[model samples]
Target: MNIFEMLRIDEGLRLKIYKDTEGYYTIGIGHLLTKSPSLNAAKSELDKAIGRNTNGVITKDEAEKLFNQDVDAAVRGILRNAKLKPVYDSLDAVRRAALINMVFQMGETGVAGFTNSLRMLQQKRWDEAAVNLAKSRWYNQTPNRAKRVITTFRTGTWDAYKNL
Candidate 1:
């Protein structure tokens, strides 16, 4: 099919994408967002997962409320439409995005909490890099999230994280 022929703008709704308590903007949905679940809702959910509420999916309406703007900008806003540019250009795109994704979910406290591991990554210490990653407090807390990012660095699978 031609590009235009394949182009179909399905129905979508607006999400507040507000800043959250964890200092990030969460894309809220349903009663929490004052709207039903939809594309933007899903995106907001994913963004929320990456932005503030780490370790497994949100289970309640109250979990959808996002409040922190700066945190959101650092983690999601810049990447939402700007095509996932890295905050630090020197780092590999995969590594940088993975770092941002981790930070988004883990929060500064969670990501920065990784002391030696981050140092190793910063130095490009490969083997140690992998080892150190699995040592964080949130190492396996969010199984899906953890596996995806670890895979990105260990296996260089950049495309897989596009949605998360």
Candidate 2:
């Protein structure tokens, strides 16, 4: 199965533009509108891309493609954030997924910014990992999501972390 399929199930697919749990206008399988459309005329472009207008909804195939590309980039982010840390690849798939999910939400630099959290992961300090994760600005902004990622890191199960 494609990663996008799993991600859609994990993250929830949105055919139309709507505010995400974080209140950002999102669409097409969790594609977040991070930049204000008007800040640089990108807003107008964004509305055409995935706004909640009549033409906002994109095709399922398109959403899947976009999600795949986004995921690929996030994986790259995780790898880059890991640098030469072999422990990163040694991590269980669940933990890897949790980290990549964090990268997806926070971007490469943002995820890398979680210095303490990453160190905890390397040391296999599961619960303490959350303590460091809580230090992240993104943590408070995305508590439920953060909880799932932290929990998944601690338990290595996707069961409790469902619905991203």
Candidate 3:
């Protein structure tokens, strides 16, 4: 399937991010929400931000920006949908959706910022991996989202491959 189709979002819609006149960064959503017209215009602005800020590629240098990105899970969720393929199962979906939201908030470098933690997660050392997850600067960026992901991570009940 085409990218936008896979995202379950409209292909006519495009998520764009750019620098504001203030010299700070911002995103353009380009759509409507009921009567609100939505922020910038779409829910995937953050992903567009990621694409622009990272040159359509993720690297270690970009993670810090995410520490400051406006990380609403609503935004994160849309960005997740737009940016990657989905896994098949529900739990993997939960973990991955949350993890991608975290990555969107933290950037690729910051997400992998925890090397040891990544190892633990790969090994399925649930509690230890999650503890490491809680140690990052991005840990509390959105406590509720982070908390949910951590719980799933530790429980091995969250899915990371649901969109595949």
Candidate 4:
């Protein structure tokens, strides 16, 4: 599957705004509307996108649009990080998607905190990179997603997409 499809599975879909596990206002496949200036503004934007005021609900197509925009932002965010650019460029498609998936969930600055893991990945030390990732609080908070992403990084394959 593609990154969008993979992320759809990972993030799940929500038509209405809801509090995430971290209690942030999120919607439309983990899109952090809380990052918007205000919750009302976020809802208004979604309404505009859907061409109607459906209370706080968004259609599936609208959700896909948001998902695409978010994924694009995540990719650009990854590429814009000077320290991550070279390593990101060095990776194959599956590994690149894995990295993007990470940045999608945690933001660029959050992923940047994985200094040792990034170093190991840059050196092509797959197992070491996976181990380092497993040591993070991110792994503890989202073990299943972390395991799939870590496995993708270690194997450099789309095995994470299989049977999930």
Candidate 5:
């Protein structure tokens, strides 16, 4: 199968700009626009591409095309960072995806600030990693989301987070 086909499965094509679960502007898969000029610029670009000045929609194929570069850059950034790579490489797919989601939402530097959690991950101490995550400011700010991440780190399954 083609790479975009898999990417489409991962991201699920979103045709219009809308707030993500966290209530931030995201469009075309996971191309997040936190603020802007960037927001309007994205809107305008999409509008132009679809031959409309507003309320334009992208095809699944278009979303796949747009998301390719963004996803590539995000994964590259996460895996290339020396501080994140070892921990990332040390985990199974589900845990790695959980960590990558954290980095994707918080940035590599932001995720790196969870020093204790990173240490636990680096040491392969899954329980301690979950505890450390629970104690974090990140967790405090968003318990539901943080819980989802920590549970995945601990259990390597979507059992706790799939619906929540």
Candidate 6:
């Protein structure tokens, strides 16, 4: 499956506002509305994206569009990071998808903070990279998701998505 399909399953689709694990107001496939510049701007953008004032819910199509946009932004964010661009470019599709998944969850800055892991990834040291990733607070915060992402990095396969 493509990155989008993989992420859809990992993040899950949500058409209405709900509290995420962190208790932040979120909507549309893990899009953190609280992280936007402002709640009003975020709501306006959401309404515009769906081409309607959705009240408190959106259609599946609207959620899909938002997911695509978020994924594209994540990709752009990764490519814009000077330290990550080359590492990202050097990866194969599965590995690249893993990187995107990481960035999608934590933002490019958050992924970039994994200095040792990124260096290992750049050197194609999959085991070392995965080991370093497993030692992170991100892993502690979301062990299951982190396990899938780290496994993807270690094996360069879509095995993580097999059962999810």
Sort the predicted structures by lDDT, highest score first. 4, 6, 5, 2, 1, 3
| Between candidates 3 and 4, the lDDT winner | 4
Counted clashes in each candidate structure = 7, 1, 18, 0, 0, 0
Error of 2 at 60 (Å): 1.7
Candidate 5 matches the true fold with a TM-score of: 0.71
Top-lDDT candidate index: 4
In the order shown, the candidates' Cα RMSDs to the true structure are: 12.0, 3.9, 13.2, 2.3, 4.5, 2.2
lDDT of 1 by residue, 61-145 (tens): 4333332332354455434422233233445756665666565554455566566776677677766777778876566555555
lDDT of 2 by residue, 1-164 (tens): 23444456556887766676756666677777555533223334445554334455667876776688789888876666554234468688777777777666767777776667777888889888867777766767777667767777787777653543
Model 4 poorest 10 in a row by lDDT: 33-42
Candidate 3 residue lDDT tens string, 1-164: 22112222211222333333223233322112122234433334444545653332233334333423333433344445423222212235445544554454445445644667666765657788888888865556545546655776677453322343
TM-scores for every candidate against the unseen true structure? 0.47, 0.77, 0.41, 0.90, 0.71, 0.90
Against the reference, the lDDT scores of all candidates come to 0.47, 0.67, 0.44, 0.87, 0.70, 0.84
Q: Where's the lowest-lDDT run of ten residues in candidate 2?
A: 37-46
**2 versus 4: better TM-score goes to:** 4
Residue pairs with clashing backbones, model 5: none
Q: Which parts of model 2 are misplaced by more than 4 Å?
A: 1-6, 21-23, 39-54, 82-87, 162-164
Q: Against the hidden true structure, what lDDT does model 5 obtain?
A: 0.70
Clash count for candidate 3 is: 18
Ranking 1 against 6 by TM-score, winner: 6
Candidate with the larger TM-score of 1 and 5: 5
Full-model lDDT, candidate 6 = 0.84
Q: What range of 10 consecutive residues in model 6 has the weakest lDDT sum?
A: 33-42
Against the correct fold, how does model 2 do in TM-score? 0.77
Q: CA shift at 11, candidate 6, in angstroms?
A: 0.4
